[PDB]
């Protein structure tokens, strides 16, 4: 039985978001790609450097916002600027969010030597698509 | 820390090759040409072999940058086949989808 | 604790100008978009999810900043930075008559911290031989000298340069090849009289 | 009602250098999703028509890249999981475009490029004969 | 030939965006672009704006502290073309050897303790030191008073000290030029020590060394502050410095005249005529007055005088002169003109005068010279109050929507002014929407605003359609009293507040709700 | 009824027709002049009010590319013609 990126059925008491409720074979059929960039085109180079930077942001954003992160990030790369879209729960005071926003924008910009955009959308809780 | 001691040795091997990449190229040019006298070529073989062992392009090994699996690594993404599926099945790689035809 | 303010969609005017809300490319903000849009595969008996808290509406590259109303306003302001194409060069035939040399160059744009693409240094120079001043003997020598770069059907000569790192160096090298080939086709050297009857093109 | 009066301040210095003439400009956008390219074509055509460029749009044939990887982490080589990368093409040709008009059109096009696509520009610059060729030198 | 090649157009690489930026204007309902567009993060009051923005500003400083603390973690570069504005910086001296070249690095890196210690070692070494380097060392020490500048992490009285290193090194100088005296005088005047600066100028005259433009700028301020003589004696000294300035052929700058007008503000009566003479001199010299120059002129003529005939003449002539002009920054106090200009219009109560001031602000990039956040709030505070009664309510509401909350958050007193305009305009139908907007604008629990709204709604009888709307607003107001944030210290229900709410729930077909209000009077006495 | 710009002025300073012919910009920069530049610019600069305003500031600072994109921007190869490479 296939087990790649799936949540198993357990009665009807475990909530599942839209991203986790679809099997990996539904990619490009029901859900899009969490990250979009030129590296994986047909005749374009510089694909490995984009991948490793993508993984670091998955680990940095998750640790920068402990517990308050809703689901996976969305990474958009236009020109030389990097846009990060996140869904964050209403956990920290708004003072701390702006502190982390300023801390993240400056630190990543001086590490990858490229401008970074960090846009946040706040939700009361995790959005539930099935079960519950 | 690199993920394994094997990965650490590869970094030193790549660094050593880069330093002696130009010197080896100049010496190897003499060997690979038959118009120079054979006496000079024999001296060239002694000098090129006197260089440190780690400064060899062939000894460079391509591993995965995440788990350092010596084989089963795609060259384009520099990732092992297990790690590549882990990122691709979650939709974290652009333009990568399950093949259906 | 802190509460959630109502979205600005309620305060949005009926006839307000949209492009002022989105001047540049920005991600889809559910509070900033008055349009009620639902996407995602629905439940067996249900409706697709709403626009708030939906990642599917966030992955898509929106075109809210390129509305047709904004496009006309954006383009009209840019009309100052333009100069008209000459009217006499209407037919493509006259373009060849007045300009016999065309040069092909390429620029590449990709998402990343770097722009250096090694494939952008290529320069392609194409010249129609019928517009030059080659003689009967000089033209035959030029074809035999340039090799396969000349097409016998379209009578076009193509020169490709890749050794120079930059496009300007290749462009200066490409034109250098064209002029040195013309000045050499007119030099009837002494050994040229040693022609073989099997080497004659006619 | 209250608006910033005359908030426009660009300068266009007309020099004495003759402008560069391009015989034909080709733009080839490549991406993974057709919908983005369909909308991007509409944006480019609408802007091009307003500037008066008389462009033509054609769709080059697509190509599909496939590769196969093992399924499990140990043995079981009779079961494979395949993957596919789809790159969709769209070409927009520009004819009889001046150098000054080419610069603004490209930068306006490039700045609004979606994050999931890229493009290549092939400019066919035209010019007269070189000085040595034009000036009679044997 | 029948073909003419048109001439190319050359433009800067950033002017293309500015052409598009002209088409797009400010958005009425949009929060400031600096803050996030998310409603949970959108500021709700002017108090939040300072807290939110400074928190983000501290984030940049916090991150840059990490970058500079560990330079080795950011040396990797993958930026093409190279961006020198993202590479980590260095503050420690890159050269640890004792040499003149390494000494210059410490001076340029805003290091005071390292420079003075290394300079002493250089002197003990016997190696010669350039006079310009010595003057450069003095300038760094004089400006900060032999102290360190303000760093991320390691008013009354004369800040200048007699036992200071600046005087010690100045005496030790073998050769002293005009610049050495000029920079010493400016520091003394800056640090509220003009007695020493004037004495040094006398020695400077004995040295037959001409003073630069900036020296006379400090001397004029120094002379007035040293003694407390009358205006006539001060003015004679002021004219004396100008005559000496002509002898040395020194042309005063814009700031030379601005500081004179600011100091003349103390003489609110005797300095009116001399102020005009200096202003006419500026036009003759050729130095165009900036916004700050007119800022001191209007305030000097504007006092607590009922006639204000002279002030009216001052402002009217200026506004015609400044009409249709775009101003570039030319004075550190240019940002205080717009706030000061609105103060004059507040007393004169001239709406037409305010529009000329506001129209000037919206021309070109002149809006960037409004001032700080509190200056911007104060500038719009007086301006919006004038928009209430001086104009029809129909246009007043349009200005209310555009300016608030996009530009500034209204004050409690400003809300009272809006209510007065509605009452005068015989329009009470917008009261429920005003209260709803009041809660959004940080005025949820303002006792002053609550009383005014309740009194106006229940002042007179209304048709049942309008009465229900007032009752719905009153019910929300009643809920606010129940959930006051001051209940931790002391919850207070005003006597008037209870009365009007009880009366309000009578004529809206809410007789049942009125019964519950009867028992509140006895409970609250 | 009298304009404030018309009347008696101070005649001590003669009206200067022209400024300095050759400014000394290529010399040791005085500290106070640099401080004046910081003060004048800091008051002038304001937090970004629109997306376009953020783009132009980055473009001048070098954060963003100079559109239209040329792949050889910032790399002139020591300003050498093709002869040094051929
Ligand atoms: Mg291990
Ligand atoms: Mg091998």
Residue B21, C-beta contacts closer than 8 angstroms, at least 6 positions apart: B57
The domain B1-91 is placed in CATH, from the list 2.40.10.220, 3.90.245.10, 1.10.287.1480, 3.20.20.70, at 1.10.287.1480
Choose the closest CB to B85 out of D81, D84, D86. Answer: D81
Spatial separation of the C-alpha atoms in residues C12 and A105, rounded to whole Å: 30
- Identify the CA nearest to E280 among candidates A75, D63, F7, C125: F7
Phi, psi torsion values for D26, nearest 5 degrees: -115, 130
Spatial separation of the C-alpha atoms in residues F71 and D3, rounded to whole Å: 41
β-pairing, D117-127 with C101-109? Answer: antiparallel
Spatial separation of the C-alpha atoms in residues C33 and E480, rounded to whole Å: 31
- CB within 8 Å: A80 and F58: no
Spatial separation of the C-alpha atoms in residues E383 and E339, rounded to whole Å: 10
Resolution to one decimal, Å: 3.6
Spatial separation of the C-alpha atoms in residues C168 and C123, rounded to whole Å: 9
Which residue is listed with tokens 């520099």? B78
Q: C-alpha distances in angstroms, E476 versus E413, E473, E482? A: 21, 5, 10
Spatial separation of the C-alpha atoms in residues F38 and F45, rounded to whole Å: 10
β-pairing, C123-128 with C156-161? Answer: antiparallel
Give the H/E segment covering residue A78: strand A74-78
Spatial separation of the C-alpha atoms in residues E517 and E503, rounded to whole Å: 9
HEC profile for chain D? CCCCCCCCCCCCEEEEEECCEEEEEEEEEEECCHHHHHHHHHHHHHHHHHHCCCCEEECCCCEEEEEEEECCCCCCCCCEEEEEEEEEEEEEEEEEEEHHHHHHHHHHHHHCCCCCEEEEEEEEEEECCCHHHHCCCC
Q: Give A27's strand partners.
A: A31
Q: Say if CB E52 and CB A94 are below 8 A apart.
A: yes
Specify the length of chain D in residues: 138
Residue A73, C-beta contacts closer than 8 angstroms, at least 6 positions apart: A34, A57, A58, A61, A84, A85, A86
Between chain D and chain E, the number of residue pairs with CB atoms below 8 A apart is 78
Closest residue in chain E to residue F35, using alpha carbons only: E143
Angle between helices F31-44 and E178-190 (to 10 degrees): 40
3-class DSSP state of F63: coil
Spatial separation of the C-alpha atoms in residues A71 and A77, rounded to whole Å: 20
Distance, C-alpha B71 to centroid of its chain: 13
Spatial separation of the C-alpha atoms in residues A33 and A27, rounded to whole Å: 7
Spatial separation of the C-alpha atoms in residues C14 and E28, rounded to whole Å: 13
Choose the closest CB to A77 out of D85, D86, D115. Answer: D115
Ligand 1 centroid to Cα of residue B63, in Å, is: 15
Phi, psi torsion values for C101, nearest 5 degrees: -120, 125
Q: C-alpha distances in angstroms, A102 versus E35, E57, E58? A: 11, 7, 8
Spatial separation of the C-alpha atoms in residues D26 and D24, rounded to whole Å: 7
Q: Say if CB A4 and CB A119 are below 8 A apart.
A: no
Contacting subunits of A (3+ beta carbon pairs below 8 A)? B, C, D, E, F
Within 8 A of C168 by CB-CB distance, chain F residues are 72
Q: C-alpha distances in angstroms, E27 versus B76, C23, E16? A: 46, 10, 22
Give the H/E segment covering residue A97: helix A94-112
β-pairing, A81-89 with A116-123? Answer: parallel
Ramachandran category for residue E442: left, alpha or beta (phi over 0 → left; psi -120 to 50 → alpha): left
Spatial separation of the C-alpha atoms in residues E104 and E93, rounded to whole Å: 10
Ligand 1 centroid to Cα of residue B4, in Å, is: 6
Distance, C-alpha E175 to centroid of its chain: 43
DSSP string, E221-282: HHHHHH----HHHHHHHHHHHHHHHHHTT----HHHHHHHHHHGGG-TTTTHHHHHHHHHHH
Distance, C-alpha E453 to centroid of its chain: 34
Q: Say if CB C158 and CB C125 are below 8 A apart.
A: yes
Residue E123, C-beta contacts closer than 8 angstroms, at least 6 positions apart: E129
Spatial separation of the C-alpha atoms in residues C148 and F44, rounded to whole Å: 64
Choose the closest CB to D69 out of B85, B95, B97. Answer: B85
Spatial separation of the C-alpha atoms in residues B26 and C36, rounded to whole Å: 68
DSSP string, C138-182: HHHHHHHHHGGGB-TTT-EEEEEE-SSSSHHHHHHHHHHHHHHHH
Mutate to test the interface with E, among A89, A101, A106 (most CBs of E within 10 A): A106
Contacting subunits of B (3+ beta carbon pairs below 8 A)? A, D
Structure tokens at F27: 């010399």
Structure tokens at E204: 């400077």
DSSP summary character for residue A16: B
DSSP summary character for residue F14: P
Distance, C-alpha D70 to centroid of its chain: 38
- Counting beta carbons within 10 angstroms of the beta carbon of residue E420, is it exposed (0 to 12), middle (13 to 18) or buried (19 or more)? middle
Structure tokens at C4: 């959630």
CB atoms within 10 A of CB E275: 20
Spatial separation of the C-alpha atoms in residues E72 and C49, rounded to whole Å: 48
Q: Give A74's strand partners.
A: A85
Expressed in percent and rounded to 5, the helix, strand and coil fractions of chain B are: 45, 5, 50
Residue E150, C-beta contacts closer than 8 angstroms, at least 6 positions apart: none
Structure tokens at E53: 């923005």
Spatial separation of the C-alpha atoms in residues C83 and E59, rounded to whole Å: 47
Within 8 A of C182 by CB-CB distance, chain D residues are 132-133
β-pairing, A35-36 with A74-78? Answer: parallel
- Identify the CA nearest to E88 among candidates E63, E112, E55: E63
β-pairing, A116-123 with B73-74? Answer: unpaired
Closest residue in chain B to residue D33, using alpha carbons only: B95
Half-sphere exposure of B22 (CA within 13 A, CB side): 1
DSSP E strand boundaries for F1-86: none
CB atoms within 10 A of CB E58: 16
Q: Chain A, 86-125: which have a CB under 8 Å from a chain C CB?
A: 87, 90, 93-94, 112-114, 119, 121-124
CB atoms within 10 A of CB F11: 9
Which residue is listed with tokens 């999981």? D81
Which residue is listed with tokens 């998402």? C111
Structure tokens at D134: 């034009």
Which residue is listed with tokens 């009289």? C193
Question: Technique behind this structure?
Answer: cryo-EM
DSSP summary character for residue C27: -
């Amino acid at each position: 039985k296939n087990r790649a990126a799936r949540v198993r059925v357990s009665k009807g008491d475990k909530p599942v978001t839209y991203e986790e409720a679809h099997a990996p074979h539904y990619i490009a059929h029901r859900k899009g790609w969490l990250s979009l960039h030129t590296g994986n085109l047909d005749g374009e180079d510089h694909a490995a450097e984009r991948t490793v930077e993508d993984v670091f942001l998955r680990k940095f954003m998750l640790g920068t916002f402990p517990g308050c992160l809703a689901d996976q990030l969305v990474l958009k790369r236009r020109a030389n600027q990097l846009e990060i879209c996140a869904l964050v729960l209403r956990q920290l005071p708004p003072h701390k969010f702006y502190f982390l926003v300023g801390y993240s924008e400056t630190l990543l910009s001086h590490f990858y030597k490229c401008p970074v955009h960090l846009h946040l959308q706040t939700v009361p809780s995790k959005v539930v698509y099935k079960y519950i | 820390y690199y993920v394994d001691w094997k990965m650490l040795r590869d970094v030193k091997r790549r660094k050593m090759a880069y330093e002696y990449a130009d010197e080896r190229l100049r010496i190897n040019s003499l060997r690979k040409n038959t118009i120079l006298p054979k006496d000079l070529q024999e001296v060239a073989d002694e000098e090129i072999a006197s260089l440190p062992r780690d400064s060899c392009p062939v000894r460079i090994r391509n591993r995965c940058v995440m788990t350092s699996r010596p084989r089963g690594v795609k060259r384009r993404w520099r990732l092992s086949r297990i790690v590549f599926r882990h990122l691709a099945d979650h939709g974290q790689l652009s333009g990568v989808q399950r093949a259906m035809w | 604790r802190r509460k959630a303010l109502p979205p600005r969609t309620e305060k949005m005017a009926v006839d307000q100008d949209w492009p002022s809300v989105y001047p540049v490319a920005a991600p889809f903000k559910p509070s900033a978009v008055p349009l009620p849009v639902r996407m995602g595969y629905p439940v067996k008996r249900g409706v697709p999810m709403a626009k708030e808290g939906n990642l599917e509406l966030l992955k898509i590259p929106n075109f809210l900043h390129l509305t047709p109303v904004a496009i006309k306003r954006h383009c009209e302001a840019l009309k100052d930075f333009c100069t008209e194409w000459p009217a006499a060069l209407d037919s493509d035939e006259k373009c060849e008559k007045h300009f016999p040399i065309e040069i092909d160059t390429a620029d590449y744009v990709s998402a990343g911290p770097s722009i250096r693409n090694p494939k952008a240094r290529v320069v392609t120079l194409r010249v129609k031989l019928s517009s030059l001043n080659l003689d009967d003997h000089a033209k035959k020598k030029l074809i035999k000298l340039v090799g396969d770069r000349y097409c016998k059907s379209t009578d076009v000569l193509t020169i490709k340069t890749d050794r120079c790192p930059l496009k300007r160096q290749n462009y200066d090298y490409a034109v250098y090849l064209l002029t040195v080939l013309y000045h050499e086709s007119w030099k009837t050297e002494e050994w040229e009289k040693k022609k073989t009857e099997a080497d004659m093109e006619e | 009602v209250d608006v910033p009066k005359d908030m426009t301040k660009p300068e266009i210095t007309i020099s004495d250098e003759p402008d560069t003439l391009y015989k034909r400009l080709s733009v080839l956008v490549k991406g993974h999703d057709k919908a983005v390219l369909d909308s991007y074509e509409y944006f480019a055509v609408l802007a091009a028509k307003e500037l008066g460029i008389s462009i033509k749009v054609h769709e080059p044939p697509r190509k599909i890249e496939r590769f196969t990887l093992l399924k499990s982490v140990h043995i079981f080589k009779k079961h494979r999981v395949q993957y596919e990368m789809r790159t969709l093409y769209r070409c927009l040709e520009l004819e009889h475009l001046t150098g000054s008009t080419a610069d603004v059109y490209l930068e306006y096009i490039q700045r609004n490029l979606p994050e999931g696509v890229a493009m290549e520009v092939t400019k066919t610059k035209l010019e007269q004969l070189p000085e040595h060729i034009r000036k009679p030198i044997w | 030939e029948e073909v003419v090649i048109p001439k190319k157009k050359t433009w800067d690489k950033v002017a293309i965006l500015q052409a598009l930026a002209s088409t797009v204007h400010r958005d009425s309902t949009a929060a400031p672009y600096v803050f996030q567009d998310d409603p949970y993060l959108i500021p709700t009051s002017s108090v939040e704006s300072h807290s939110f923005l400074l928190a983000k500003k501290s984030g940049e400083n916090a991150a840059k502290f990490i970058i500079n603390s560990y330079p080795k973690y950011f040396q990797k570069d993958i930026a093409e073309p190279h961006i020198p504005c993202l590479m980590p910086e260095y503050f420690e001296p890159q050269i640890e050897d004792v040499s003149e070249a390494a000494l210059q690095e410490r001076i340029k890196l805003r290091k005071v303790k390292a420079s003075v210690d290394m300079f002493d070692q250089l002197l003990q070494a016997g190696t010669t030191v350039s006079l310009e380097t010595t003057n450069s060392l003095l300038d760094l020490l004089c400006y900060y008073g032999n102290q360190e500048p303000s760093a991320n992490y390691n008013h009354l009285g004369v800040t200048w000290r007699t036992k200071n290193n600046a005087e010690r090194i100045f005496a030790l100088m073998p050769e002293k030029n005009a610049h050495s005296y000029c920079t010493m005088i400016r520091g003394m005047v800056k640090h509220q020590a003009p007695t020493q600066a004037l004495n040094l100028y006398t020695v400077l005259l004995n040295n037959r060394l001409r003073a630069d433009v900036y020296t006379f700028n400090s001397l004029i301020e120094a002379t007035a502050l040293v003694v407390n003589e009358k205006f006539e004696e001060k003015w004679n000294n002021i004219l004396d410095l100008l005559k000496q300035m002509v002898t040395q052929n020194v042309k005063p700058n814009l700031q030379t005249f601005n500081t004179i007008l600011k100091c003349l503000r103390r003489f609110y009566a005797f300095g009116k005529l001399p102020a005009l003479q200096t202003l006419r001199e500026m036009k003759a010299i050729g130095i165009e007055p900036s916004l700050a120059t007119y800022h001191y002129v209007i305030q000097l003529f504007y006092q607590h005088e009922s006639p204000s005939k002279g002030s009216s003449l001052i402002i009217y002539d200026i506004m015609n002169e400044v009409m249709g002009k775009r101003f570039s920054p030319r004075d550190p106090d240019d940002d205080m003109f717009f706030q000061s200009a609105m103060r004059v219009c507040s007393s004169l109560r001239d709406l037409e005068l305010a529009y000329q001031v506001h129209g000037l602000l919206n021309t070109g990039d002149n809006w960037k010279l409004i001032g700080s956040d509190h200056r911007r709030n104060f500038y719009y505070s007086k301006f919006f109050n004038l928009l209430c009664f001086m104009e029809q309510i129909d246009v007043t509401l349009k200005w209310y929507k555009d300016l608030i909350p996009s530009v500034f958050f209204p004050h409690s007193q400003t809300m009272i002014d809006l209510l007065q305009a509605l009452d005068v305009a015989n329009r009470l139908d917008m009261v429920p929407q005003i209260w709803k907007d009041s809660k959004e604008y940080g005025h949820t629990f303002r006792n002053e605003l609550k009383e005014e709204i309740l009194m106006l709604m229940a002042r007179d009888q209304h048709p049942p359609e309008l009465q229900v709307a007032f009752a719905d607003c009153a019910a929300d107001i009643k809920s606010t009293y129940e959930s006051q944030d001051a209940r931790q210290t002391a919850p207070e229900w005003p006597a008037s507040s209870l009365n009007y709410v009880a009366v309000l729930f009578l004529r809206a077909g809410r007789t049942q709700e009125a019964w519950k209000m009867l028992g509140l009077f006895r409970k609250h006495n | 009824r009298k304009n404030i710009f018309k009347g008696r002025r101070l005649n001590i300073f003669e009206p200067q027709a022209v400024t300095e012919e050759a400014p000394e910009t290529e010399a040791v920069p005085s500290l106070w002049d640099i401080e004046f530049a910081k003060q004048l610019a800091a008051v002038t600069e304001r937090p970004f009010q629109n997306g376009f305003e953020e783009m132009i500031q980055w473009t001048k600072e070098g954060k963003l590319w100079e559109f239209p994109i040329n792949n050889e921007a910032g790399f002139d190869d020591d300003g050498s013609e093709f002869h040094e490479h051929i």
